[PDB]
Design an enzyme around this catalytic site. Structure first.
Site, PDB file in Angstrom:
ATOM      1  N   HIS B  43       0.819  -1.217   0.000  1.00  0.00           N
ATOM      2  CA  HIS B  43       0.000   0.000   0.000  1.00  0.00           C
ATOM      3  C   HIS B  43       0.858   1.275   0.000  1.00  0.00           C
ATOM      4  O   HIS B  43       1.992   1.215   0.466  1.00  0.00           O
ATOM      5  CB  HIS B  43      -0.943  -0.017   1.198  1.00  0.00           C
ATOM      6  CG  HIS B  43      -1.959  -1.113   1.133  1.00  0.00           C
ATOM      7  ND1 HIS B  43      -2.024  -2.090   2.104  1.00  0.00           N
ATOM      8  CD2 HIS B  43      -2.924  -1.345   0.210  1.00  0.00           C
ATOM      9  CE1 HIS B  43      -3.036  -2.867   1.758  1.00  0.00           C
ATOM     10  NE2 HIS B  43      -3.606  -2.456   0.624  1.00  0.00           N
ATOM     11  N   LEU B  62      -3.145   1.220  21.414  1.00  0.00           N
ATOM     12  CA  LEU B  62      -4.526   0.746  21.347  1.00  0.00           C
ATOM     13  C   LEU B  62      -4.847  -0.170  22.523  1.00  0.00           C
ATOM     14  O   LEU B  62      -5.871   0.033  23.166  1.00  0.00           O
ATOM     15  CB  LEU B  62      -4.820   0.037  20.020  1.00  0.00           C
ATOM     16  CG  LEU B  62      -4.834   0.899  18.755  1.00  0.00           C
ATOM     17  CD1 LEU B  62      -4.388   0.090  17.553  1.00  0.00           C
ATOM     18  CD2 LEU B  62      -6.196   1.500  18.498  1.00  0.00           C
ATOM     19  N   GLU B  64      -3.405  -0.284  25.446  1.00  0.00           N
ATOM     20  CA  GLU B  64      -3.386   0.587  26.626  1.00  0.00           C
ATOM     21  C   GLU B  64      -4.685   1.403  26.729  1.00  0.00           C
ATOM     22  O   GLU B  64      -5.161   1.663  27.845  1.00  0.00           O
ATOM     23  CB  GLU B  64      -2.188   1.552  26.566  1.00  0.00           C
ATOM     24  CG  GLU B  64      -0.835   0.925  26.873  1.00  0.00           C
ATOM     25  CD  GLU B  64       0.384   1.728  26.437  1.00  0.00           C
ATOM     26  OE1 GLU B  64       1.477   1.479  26.994  1.00  0.00           O
ATOM     27  OE2 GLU B  64       0.263   2.566  25.512  1.00  0.00           O
ATOM     28  N   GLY B  66      -7.606   0.446  25.850  1.00  0.00           N
ATOM     29  CA  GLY B  66      -8.700  -0.462  26.184  1.00  0.00           C
ATOM     30  C   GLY B  66      -9.239  -1.267  25.020  1.00  0.00           C
ATOM     31  O   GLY B  66     -10.194  -2.032  25.181  1.00  0.00           O
ATOM     32  N   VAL B  69      -6.771  -6.074  21.684  1.00  0.00           N
ATOM     33  CA  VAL B  69      -5.683  -6.314  20.746  1.00  0.00           C
ATOM     34  C   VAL B  69      -5.146  -7.756  20.896  1.00  0.00           C
ATOM     35  O   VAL B  69      -4.771  -8.134  22.008  1.00  0.00           O
ATOM     36  CB  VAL B  69      -4.570  -5.219  20.846  1.00  0.00           C
ATOM     37  CG1 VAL B  69      -3.493  -5.419  19.779  1.00  0.00           C
ATOM     38  CG2 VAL B  69      -5.159  -3.813  20.736  1.00  0.00           C
ATOM     39  N   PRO B  70      -5.128  -8.577  19.807  1.00  0.00           N
ATOM     40  CA  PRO B  70      -4.566  -9.940  19.924  1.00  0.00           C
ATOM     41  C   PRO B  70      -3.031  -9.932  19.969  1.00  0.00           C
ATOM     42  O   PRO B  70      -2.430  -8.898  19.660  1.00  0.00           O
ATOM     43  CB  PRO B  70      -5.062 -10.620  18.650  1.00  0.00           C
ATOM     44  CG  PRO B  70      -5.161  -9.505  17.641  1.00  0.00           C
ATOM     45  CD  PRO B  70      -5.555  -8.284  18.417  1.00  0.00           C
ATOM     46  N   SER B  72      -0.880 -11.602  17.983  1.00  0.00           N
ATOM     47  CA  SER B  72      -0.525 -11.537  16.568  1.00  0.00           C
ATOM     48  C   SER B  72      -1.808 -11.660  15.759  1.00  0.00           C
ATOM     49  O   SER B  72      -2.875 -11.804  16.345  1.00  0.00           O
ATOM     50  CB  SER B  72       0.480 -12.634  16.198  1.00  0.00           C
ATOM     51  OG  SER B  72      -0.101 -13.918  16.027  1.00  0.00           O
TER      52      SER B  72
END
Lengths: 128, 131, 118, 131
Positions: B43, B62, B64, B66, B69-70, B72
């Site tokens: 991109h 992100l 932090e 809340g 977030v996975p 990986s």
């Protein structure tokens, strides 16, 4: 893989995208809030008959009352109608040489899908 | 994705209390951190200029803030399912009974390709082959 | 024989009602009697009905000598009837395609068996 | 079937010891016996001239000869299965393991008729319909 003798391990949509990475390294075994409605009508800029049919089939299985493609704009041909499918029924979608007419003839349209090349994409979007 | 600071507007929105719904997010481009030189990805705007523009930095911020977030991308399905199951349990979502959709006939082209049908050629030539 | 061709009916009925004599049509209908008693679809079709009725017309309308009637059939006056008649349909189609703004045709390759030498 | 004495050649063959394999037989035309007048059935040779040519008479003779004759046509399946099962039991027959056969594609005509496929018309007319 069979004909050459080269070891090729082939997987589909049923396999996870990054599953082959694990296999290969031997770690794992082998403005507006609402944009669209069930009523939304669109103008396709470009001769993208395959895309239009794609839309029309989605609309049918979604049990939409009417097709989402109202008309197409293609400046190289004259004005004409294009054959399509609404389930097993054949239907006609108008193709216009000028955008001005497409807009005029189809006031229900609030969406334009632009398939213009990177070159002709600025001017056409500007025109819309 | 790596490059840009657009993802941070979400952290802002959560902190401001505008965004209340559960958000799951993963930023791709974590590999870029391991490269000795600047690598321009597929991109156009997949180029980190500041240290804040990295996928690693964005994912940390992100998490932090809340956002769910996975670890990986591989754990993305897991965390989405986790969030969803909790929302069903809390009655936030009530899954609707599945109704079968209208049936569309198979395209001839496709049918012939998967060799499900057979249709005889009406013509026969033997002088020229343009195919 | 029990499910007739309407074009045949229309003509057969006109011919029977207005022609003074229809000897060849009568002969053909007798042949039809025989063939339909083999297989019921071996009916006198519209080409046979027009063909024999036209002969009966040339021979029995009283405007032609036998020689003249025979010469006209031979020089293919009957081919003229079909050509002239069908020209209307053909022009009709031409106009229709033009009005339907129909594009260039190319026959699909999957309908052609290419049996070339090696 | 009613009419003829062909079925009796079998009784003869069994008696003579030429025919040893189990034979199941049913002669159709039992109804004819109940009719006040002679009835000519569908077939050309479905006419009983002698008393021996009747389906009833033939069935009796065959049953006496040792042929496996059912009560009516309805019991034919039953008697066939009976005989078969005894032959498996006696090891006369050893049923072979079933192999799946080669697969043939559906004819286009049929597929289109049952509306499983759709193929777009290349042509369009509006002036005449001969169909």
């Amino acid at each position: 893989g069979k004909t050459t003798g080269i070891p090729i391990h082939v997987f589909g949509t049923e396999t996870h995208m990054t599953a082959i990475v694990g296999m290969a390294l031997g770690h794992r075994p082998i403005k507006s809030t609402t944009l669209f409605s069930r009523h939304t009508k669109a103008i396709v800029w470009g001769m993208q008959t395959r895309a239009v049919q794609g839309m029309l089939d989605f609309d049918y299985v979604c049990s939409r009352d009417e097709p989402s493609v109202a008309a197409m704009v293609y400046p190289f041909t004259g004005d004409h109608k294009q054959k399509f499918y609404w389930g097993h029924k054949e239907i006609l979608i108008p193709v216009f040489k000028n955008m001005a007419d497409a807009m005029r003839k189809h006031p229900e349209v609030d969406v334009l899908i632009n398939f213009a090349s990177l070159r002709s994409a600025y001017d056409s979007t500007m025109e819309t | 994705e790596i490059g840009g600071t657009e993802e941070y507007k979400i952290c802002r929105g959560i902190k401001e209390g505008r965004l209340t719904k559960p958000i799951v997010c993963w930023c791709i481009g974590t590999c870029a951190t391991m490269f000795s030189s600047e690598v321009q990805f597929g991109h156009a705007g997949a180029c980190a200029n500041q240290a804040s523009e990295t996928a690693v930095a964005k994912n940390q911020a992100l998490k932090e803030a809340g956002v769910f977030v996975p670890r990986s991308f591989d754990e993305l399905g897991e965390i989405i399912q986790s969030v969803y199951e909790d929302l069903v349990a809390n009655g936030v979502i009530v899954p609707a009974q599945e109704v079968p959709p209208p049936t569309v006939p198979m395209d001839y082209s496709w049918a012939r390709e998967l060799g499900l049908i057979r249709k005889p050629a009406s013509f026969m030539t033997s002088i020229c082959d343009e195919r | 024989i029990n499910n007739p061709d309407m074009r045949v009916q229309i003509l057969k009925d006109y011919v029977r009602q207005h022609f003074p004599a229809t000897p060849l049509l009568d002969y053909a209908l007798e042949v039809e009697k025989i063939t339909t008693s083999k297989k019921p679809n071996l009916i006198l079709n519209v080409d046979g009905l027009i063909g024999v009725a036209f002969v009966d017309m040339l021979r029995n309308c009283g405007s032609f000598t036998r020689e003249e009637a025979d010469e006209y059939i031979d020089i293919g006056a009957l081919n003229g009837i079909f050509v002239l008649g069908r020209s209307m349909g053909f022009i009709g189609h031409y106009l229709d395609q033009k009005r339907l703004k129909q594009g260039l045709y190319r026959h699909p390759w999957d309908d052609i068996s290419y049996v070339l030498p090696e």
